Design a protein around this nucleic acid. Structure first.
Ligand SMILES: [Mg+2]
Ligand SMILES: [Mg+2]
Ligand SMILES: [Mg+2]
Ligand SMILES: [Mg+2]
Ligand SMILES: [Mg+2]
Ligand SMILES: [Mg+2]
Ligand SMILES: [Mg+2]
Ligand SMILES: [Mg+2]
Ligand SMILES: [Mg+2]
Ligand SMILES: [Mg+2]
Ligand SMILES: [Mg+2]
Ligand SMILES: [Mg+2]
Ligand SMILES: [Mg+2]
Ligand SMILES: [Mg+2]
Ligand SMILES: [Mg+2]
Ligand SMILES: [Mg+2]
Ligand SMILES: [Mg+2]
Ligand SMILES: [Mg+2]
Ligand SMILES: [Mg+2]
Ligand SMILES: [Mg+2]
Ligand SMILES: [Mg+2]
Ligand SMILES: [Mg+2]
Ligand SMILES: [Mg+2]
Ligand SMILES: [Mg+2]
Ligand SMILES: [Mg+2]
Ligand SMILES: [Mg+2]
Ligand SMILES: [Mg+2]
Ligand SMILES: [Mg+2]
Ligand SMILES: [Mg+2]
Ligand SMILES: [Mg+2]
Ligand SMILES: [Mg+2]
Ligand SMILES: [Mg+2]
Ligand SMILES: [Mg+2]
Ligand SMILES: [Mg+2]
Ligand SMILES: [Mg+2]
Ligand SMILES: [Mg+2]
Ligand SMILES: [Mg+2]
Ligand SMILES: [Mg+2]
Ligand SMILES: [Mg+2]
Ligand SMILES: [Mg+2]
Ligand SMILES: [Mg+2]
Ligand SMILES: [Mg+2]
Ligand SMILES: [Mg+2]
Ligand SMILES: [Mg+2]
Ligand SMILES: [Mg+2]
Ligand SMILES: [Mg+2]
Ligand SMILES: [Mg+2]
Ligand SMILES: [Mg+2]
Ligand SMILES: [Mg+2]
Ligand SMILES: [Mg+2]
Ligand SMILES: [Mg+2]
Ligand SMILES: [Mg+2]
Ligand SMILES: [Mg+2]
Ligand SMILES: [Mg+2]
Ligand SMILES: [Mg+2]
Ligand SMILES: [Mg+2]
Ligand SMILES: [Mg+2]
Ligand SMILES: [Mg+2]
Ligand SMILES: [Mg+2]
Ligand SMILES: [Mg+2]
Ligand SMILES: [Mg+2]
Ligand SMILES: [Mg+2]
Ligand SMILES: [Mg+2]
Ligand SMILES: [Mg+2]
Ligand SMILES: [Mg+2]
Ligand SMILES: [Mg+2]
Ligand SMILES: [Mg+2]
Ligand SMILES: [Mg+2]
Ligand SMILES: [Mg+2]
Ligand SMILES: [Mg+2]
Ligand SMILES: [Mg+2]
Lengths: 123, 209, 114, 56, 118
RNA sequence: CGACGACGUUGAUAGGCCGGGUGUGUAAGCGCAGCGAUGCGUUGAGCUAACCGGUACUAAUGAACCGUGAGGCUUAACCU
RNA sequence: UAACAGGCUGAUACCGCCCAAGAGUUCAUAUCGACGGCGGUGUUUGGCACCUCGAUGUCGGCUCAUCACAUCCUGGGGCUGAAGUAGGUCCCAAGGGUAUGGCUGUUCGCCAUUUAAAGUGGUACGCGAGCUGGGUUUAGAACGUCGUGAGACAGUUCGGUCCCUAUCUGCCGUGGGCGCUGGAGAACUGAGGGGGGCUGCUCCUAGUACGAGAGGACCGGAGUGGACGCAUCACUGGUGUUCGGGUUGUCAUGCCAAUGGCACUGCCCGGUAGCUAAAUGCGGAAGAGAUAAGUGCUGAAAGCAUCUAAGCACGAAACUUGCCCC
RNA sequence: GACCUGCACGAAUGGCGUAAUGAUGGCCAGGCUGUCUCCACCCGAGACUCAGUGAAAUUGAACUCGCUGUGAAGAUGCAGUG
RNA sequence: GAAUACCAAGGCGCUUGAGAGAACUCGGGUGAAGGAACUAGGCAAAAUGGUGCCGUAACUUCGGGAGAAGGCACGCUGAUAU
RNA sequence: GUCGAGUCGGCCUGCGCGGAAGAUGUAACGGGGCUAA
RNA sequence: CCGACUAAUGUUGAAAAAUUAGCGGAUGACUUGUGGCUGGGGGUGAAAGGCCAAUCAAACCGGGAGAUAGCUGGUUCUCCC
RNA sequence: GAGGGGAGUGAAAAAGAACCUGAAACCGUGUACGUACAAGCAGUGGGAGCACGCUUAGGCGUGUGACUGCGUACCUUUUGUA
């Protein structure tokens, strides 16, 4: 349940460590992004020699949330933190080559098959 | 198509084989007894009036008792009317049960919504609150302005303001029929319906379809 | 109400093992990836149990691939294929939410010898 | 906020048209002591429905 | 809204209500008949009757539970030694409320509440 | 607040009571181990609101009160 | 007899039109339109001093709106210098919809990032007996500047009391009276009124039609969303000072043990019912009638031509219904 | 922080610095949060009902509606109409 | 500690009560996810908070800055020591 | 070259037509209504 | 104990300046009791035109006094020209 | 008790000490008529019905006022004021 100003951890090796959501995309007055949703981010902290730099503006897909996801039987999966995977602003494909920590079956789509492939675990 | 009068038993869930949980309202539809048939010649329109359930004898007044006796039908707890379609015919004293919905995919359910009493504009009309702080003087949930100035010099009719909320007729449209259980006089519909547990419900085949 | 209790009783699993908060359980859940249905294990500590008949639930916490994850299972859901207790834990509370602030050695749960 | 014109005695009476008290429709009679009492209340002499409930 | 809620606030806070009804249960056990306001008598039923039910089973633990409530060993002793035995075969309804008009000071509706076998 | 709905002994309306559920999480007392804090057994114990299923134990009193006694004129269509 | 708002006016402003030099390869009129001409609005800057000086609170924000249409989006259409995609321009259309942030008192504006779109105006530049009080506009102080000085400056700077219990109209709700022609208990009909009406993306049709290619549809269908609304509590959760427990200090119940009071529920951990959103069901429609702009059929006046005069057919979120509530 | 183009700084109506100090003015960050997204529930005191007591400002008189117009030019009271 | 909490001696429950458990106001408690996005401004609220020890930068008028910052321990029982 | 009664486009003039968008409500005959009213 | 920076409340108040939560000084140019002195163009002022008995760019009371008011208000029975 | 009803005094107690006369505003009880489909300075012109009463037995007198034409208080100040 991510909104403007939300800080997120980074679940890839793109070089960013902390990013902030600056826009929830895909709708007028749209409040929240959940797992599988694409957000607009600014990089607030990044490791010295990564593929991305502090202050860059780009896109990310949310892959873990504290609020979590519901399943058709009514069960929920919650995570200890919020995390996203950085995406190239135009192609919206991952910038990093590795994906860290678990992700969820909600990302099983044409657009995010690469994340599923790279993730160590899909819940 | 006619409908049936039931009772909101409560909600539960149906687990399917593929791991879906369907939230369902359980509606007890006992046999609906036709107490009067209205036709164009005598009444100006085509309809049936039904009753269901039962009422204690000393709670039935002589007028209502005479009305039931003319139908040759035991007294139910109330009387409800359903308009008749062109191909629809019924007889006084006929019993109509929940198998009426055997092949119906979707239903409209009408009940009396729960009563919230005197509601403020925030609860009743989703008005936003003013500042909790920043100097606000006694005006945190209050409505704000209710009009203009000298023009028009009045409040418009239908202005959203505080008042009674709920305890009114509500219809929820095109709910999936999950199960019809003729033996147990039960209809299960997917999702919530108006009213509190135990209250009367009017169920009719969905008008939108 | 008797009507709804009947409707729920007809749906309840009759093979649910006994387990308590603090136990380590393994839950096997069906996962459908295409036309393929297979069982995936989720193993962790039970931090909460909701005893509510057909609507009973339990919450399992694990650290997985560096990340803490909780799953609230609907006990009688067909998504849950089997539950097995791997370890009996000795705790005194019903709800182990305090474990959310513990990691590693501080997160250990004494075994319940019985 | 205060009136701009003095309300009339007529308007005062119209407003008070709902102020009249209602008398108790009927008093009940104790079956044993025969004294009058408020329905479902005890009598002045400690009787209720024929039973001497309260003494002294 | 107060849907399905039970219990009267009686224009008091919870600690005041608790102390008041401890005192009043003590008084009803002691005197077997008291006069109070009608709403207070109706609320008092819910405090006094479970005390009598508890007193039906005489044990150290039950006496200690009765003392934690009541805080009066004379009241506890009367409960277990007299009222429990008196009500041993009565399934609830150990009290009776008798409406008795209106208070002079404040027009408060009044009632006697008494033990049924007084 | 009025109002609206249920019920008043031919009664489940409310309280209580009984059974259950739920929640908390192994009461008190006693015993054992330990110098002791404490641990262990009895014991998933004890307690458990507004919940579910029941139950006339308590309170819903016989009455009384209001409301009447066949319901205007004319004309037309009929029944005699 | 000025400052605010109203009023009168409409030079100015904004909008529309007429003539057509010329631009537009050609070609005034796809688009634009010189020199000039004619109007509309009340809408800017103003003019006036009619109302109020025994007081009509004046910026901006917030809350809550309501109307106009000169339409921002969505809908319908003509022309195009309209291949397609996407545009331009004009006509019809007011049903619904119509950003969040950084800076700054700002309105505005610029900037960042959204969106189908981020409309333009009227409503005392709507709304302070609804909120605010950052700005303007008292008394303190200082700078620059002016002044011999007191002081002064739509120059700047730091600080600086926002009252009202609603009688009437109005509006949201809710009862009481009488009436409706003997009295009574019910179920209705439906005059009439209100609500609702938004839209993205993806896939198929189809890599088809179009096109040298790059690209890439109409018409129709399917799914899934944003925002909004109604209901509900099965689920996930919040609350849960009325349930259970842990614990600090102290006082008491003779003492031990066990309990109770007080300390924000002393402090906390959990949590039943209810209430509830972040939870999950459902909705906007289809269809019908009459139409707008527009398109036509047949057809004379006018032997031709002509959608019109007679007659006949299509045509949109507007209108009347259909849906929900009274 | 610089630059200098100081409309209109400048040396005891002191100039430029300055550690410490300040319920002093401005700006930024960590923590923190119902300030906010967007409000929900709860505990209390009022508000509401009954009994007792019992004010106020204001007030030409009132049988005190809407709309469009008129009109000392912004109308419950005029015209028409609903 | 003359702070504070609970008490003693002692003194009091504040000269309207009784109900109810709407909006709204006042004074408080808690809150999913987010965390200053609020606003003129973090206004208000939330937060920090003790003692001992470890450790502490620029700058400085050599006093300071400094409780800078940051961190560890902390109850109870037994022994050392009836 | 083909049909058999008019055909054409200038002027002057009476009455009408378009040009003609606004904000609470018809709201630019006082209303109803009027083809004469 | 002396103060009074912020907010909420209160604003026909519980109060003609307070209450509540916070806030500053707290061995000093500190704070307090009792008594004394300074008097109105005068006092006193770590200076705000502050304070001098809820009164201050000239206190209060009485007097000149019915100041003056080219201003505002008001101005009382009837009929005829 | 307060207060009152009688009895008594007195020319009078409706002169009773809240005391001669005892106005008006203002507030009641009783009777007549009107009034619950009706829009505004509340009257005025017209006017039915009802009630009570009148020496000719006839209309009239008194009270009320359905319905209907017209109708925006007063003073002051003003060019001009609902
Ligand atoms: Mg309710
Ligand atoms: Mg808001
Ligand atoms: Mg204030
Ligand atoms: Mg407030
Ligand atoms: Mg006035
Ligand atoms: Mg009244
Ligand atoms: Mg209940
Ligand atoms: Mg009270
Ligand atoms: Mg307490
Ligand atoms: Mg039980
Ligand atoms: Mg215990
Ligand atoms: Mg002006
Ligand atoms: Mg102007
Ligand atoms: Mg002039
Ligand atoms: Mg004016
Ligand atoms: Mg005035
Ligand atoms: Mg238009
Ligand atoms: Mg319209
Ligand atoms: Mg429509
Ligand atoms: Mg902006
Ligand atoms: Mg910032
Ligand atoms: Mg304005
Ligand atoms: Mg505007
Ligand atoms: Mg105000
Ligand atoms: Mg106003
Ligand atoms: Mg000054
Ligand atoms: Mg509507
Ligand atoms: Mg439930
Ligand atoms: Mg919970
Ligand atoms: Mg809690
Ligand atoms: Mg407790
Ligand atoms: Mg002890
Ligand atoms: Mg005590
Ligand atoms: Mg104490
Ligand atoms: Mg032709
Ligand atoms: Mg200088
Ligand atoms: Mg010099
Ligand atoms: Mg200096
Ligand atoms: Mg009162
Ligand atoms: Mg009127
Ligand atoms: Mg008006
Ligand atoms: Mg007007
Ligand atoms: Mg103290
Ligand atoms: Mg409350
Ligand atoms: Mg509050
Ligand atoms: Mg809090
Ligand atoms: Mg929160
Ligand atoms: Mg949280
Ligand atoms: Mg944070
Ligand atoms: Mg901001
Ligand atoms: Mg903002
Ligand atoms: Mg603060
Ligand atoms: Mg705090
Ligand atoms: Mg219009
Ligand atoms: Mg001072
Ligand atoms: Mg203070
Ligand atoms: Mg200091
Ligand atoms: Mg100090
Ligand atoms: Mg000065
Ligand atoms: Mg003074
Ligand atoms: Mg002088
Ligand atoms: Mg003189
Ligand atoms: Mg004089
Ligand atoms: Mg006497
Ligand atoms: Mg005399
Ligand atoms: Mg006299
Ligand atoms: Mg009438
Ligand atoms: Mg009518
Ligand atoms: Mg008139
Ligand atoms: Mg004038
Ligand atoms: Mg005039």
């Amino acid at each position: 349940m991510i909104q403007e100003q939300t800080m997120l951890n980074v679940a890839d090796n793109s070089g960013a460590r902390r990013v902030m959501c600056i826009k929830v995309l895909g709708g007028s007055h749209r409040r929240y992004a959940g797992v599988g949703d694409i957000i607009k981010i600014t990089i607030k902290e990044a490791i010295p020699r990564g593929k991305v730099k502090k202050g860059d503006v780009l896109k990310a897909v949310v892959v873990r949330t504290k609020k979590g996801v519901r399943r058709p039987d009514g069960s929920v999966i919650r995570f200890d933190g919020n995390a996203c995977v950085l995406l190239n602003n135009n192609s919206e494909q991952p910038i990093g080559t590795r994906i860290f920590g678990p992700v969820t079956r909600e990302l099983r789509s044409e657009k995010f098959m690469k994340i599923i492939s790279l993730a160590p675990e899909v819940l | 198509m006619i409908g049936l009068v039931g009772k909101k038993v409560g909600m539960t869930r149906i687990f399917t084989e593929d791991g879906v949980s369907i939230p369902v309202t359980v509606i007890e539809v006992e046999a609906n007894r036709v107490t009067q048939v209205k036709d164009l010649a005598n009444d100006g329109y085509r309809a049936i009036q039904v009753t269901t359930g039962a009422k204690k004898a000393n709670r039935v007044t002589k007028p209502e008792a005479g009305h039931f006796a003319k139908a040759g039908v035991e007294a139910g707890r109330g009387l409800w009317e359903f308009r008749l379609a062109e191909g629809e015919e019924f007889t006084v004293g006929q019993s109509i049960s929940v198998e009426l919905f055997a092949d119906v995919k979707k239903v409209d359910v009408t009940g009396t919504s729960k009563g919230k009493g005197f509601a403020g504009t925030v609860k009743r009309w989703n008005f936003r609150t003013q500042d909790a702080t920043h100097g606000n003087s006694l005006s945190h949930r209050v409505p704000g302005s209710i009009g203009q100035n000298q023009t028009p010099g009045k409040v418009f009719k239908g202005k959203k303001m505080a008042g009674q909320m709920g305890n009114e007729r509500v219809t929820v449209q095109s709910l999936d029929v999950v199960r019809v259980d003729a033996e147990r006089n039960l209809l299960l519909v997917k999702g919530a319906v108006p009213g509190a547990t135990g209250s009367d419900l009017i169920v009719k085949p969905a008008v939108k379809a | 109400s008797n009507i709804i209790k009947q409707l729920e009783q007809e749906q309840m699993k009759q093979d649910v093992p006994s387990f308590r908060p603090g136990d380590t359980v393994e839950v096997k859940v069906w996962v459908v990836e295409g036309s393929k249905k297979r069982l995936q294990a989720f193993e962790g500590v039970v931090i909460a149990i909701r005893n509510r008949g057909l609507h009973s639930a339990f919450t399992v916490r694990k650290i997985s691939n560096g990340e803490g994850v909780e799953r609230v299972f609907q006990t009688h859901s067909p998504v849950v294929d089997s539950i097995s207790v791997k370890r009996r834990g000795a705790v005194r509370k019903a709800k182990l939410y305090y474990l959310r602030e513990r990691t590693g050695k501080a997160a250990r749960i004494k075994e319940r010898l019985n | 906020a205060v009136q701009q014109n003095k309300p009339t005695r007529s308007k005062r009476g119209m407003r008070r048209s709902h102020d009249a008290l209602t008398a108790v429709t009927s008093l009940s009679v104790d079956k044993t002591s025969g004294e009058k009492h408020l329905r479902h209340h005890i009598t002045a002499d400690g009787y209720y429905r024929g039973r001497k409930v309260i003494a002294k | 809204m107060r849907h399905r809620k039970s219990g009267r606030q009686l224009n008091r806070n919870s600690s005041h209500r608790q102390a008041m009804f401890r005192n009043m249960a003590g008084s009803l056990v002691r005197h077997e008949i008291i006069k109070t306001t009608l709403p207070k008598a109706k609320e008092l039923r819910r405090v006094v009757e479970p005390l009598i039910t508890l007193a039906k089973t005489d044990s150290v633990a039950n006496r200690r539970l009765a003392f934690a409530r009541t805080r009066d060993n004379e009241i506890v002793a009367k409960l277990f030694n007299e009222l429990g035995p008196r009500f041993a075969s009565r399934a609830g309804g150990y009290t009776r409320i008798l409406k008795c008009g209106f208070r002079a000071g404040d027009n408060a509706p009044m009632a006697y509440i008494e033990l049924v076998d007084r």
